[model samples]
Target chain A: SRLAEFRAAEKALQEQMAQLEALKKDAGLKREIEFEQKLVGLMKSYDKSLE
Target chain B: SRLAEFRAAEKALQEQMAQLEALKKDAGLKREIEFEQKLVGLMKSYDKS
Candidate 1:
């Protein structure tokens, strides 16, 4: 059924998000996340300057 | 399409797994993961018994 299918997909996404949240606090994982945040911030800031 | 939805879910799960793999090197995270694995094995064993 469409309802069951959607529920399963949504539940799996939540599980992934929960795991992602925990993994985020890992020191090694934080390095990747920190780099990403800086890169994204730069893009938003730099992109604005370009346009 | 169903393909897109399933692929997106697959990608998300993979992303989570990738994060987990990276975290496995963390001493605290390794303890949690190893404990969970042991608990899962106990559940399976106890269930069978």
Candidate 2:
């Protein structure tokens, strides 16, 4: 049977995250991290969780 | 066993985010949003397909 797509996406994300971590020491990657940081912060601030 | 490494990564990301937000009311952050928007859009589209 085919596996769940969400699980596949999660695995892809995890793999990409691992790749990113491996490249963390590069200067260009520092800029990418800066950008990611701002974006994640914005997402957290705009939380729309329901009770 | 794997928790510490993931938690450290998360902590580092959180620290970076906190610093980024603190400097949000500045010129550097504007273009940052554009890049973020494009990335999020791309991810959303990929998720949809």
lDDT of 2 by residue, A1-51 (tens): 012333354465566567547755666656766787999988887784532
Q: Which stretches of candidate 2 lie over 4 Å from their true place?
A: A1-51, B27-49
lDDT of each: 0.63, 0.59
Q: Write the per-residue lDDT of candidate 2 for residues B1-49, one digit (tens) a residue.
A: 2434545776766655554455554454556666778999999899875
User: By DockQ, who's the top model here?
Assistant: 1
The local lDDT score (0 to 100) that residue A43 gets in candidate 1 is 93
**lDDT score of residue A12 within candidate 2:** 57
Please report the interface RMSD of model 2 to 1 decimal.
16.4
lDDT of 2 at B36: 70
Q: Per-residue alpha-carbon lDDT of model 1 for A1-51, expressed as tens digits?
A: 433444455576678767545554456655666787999999999989988
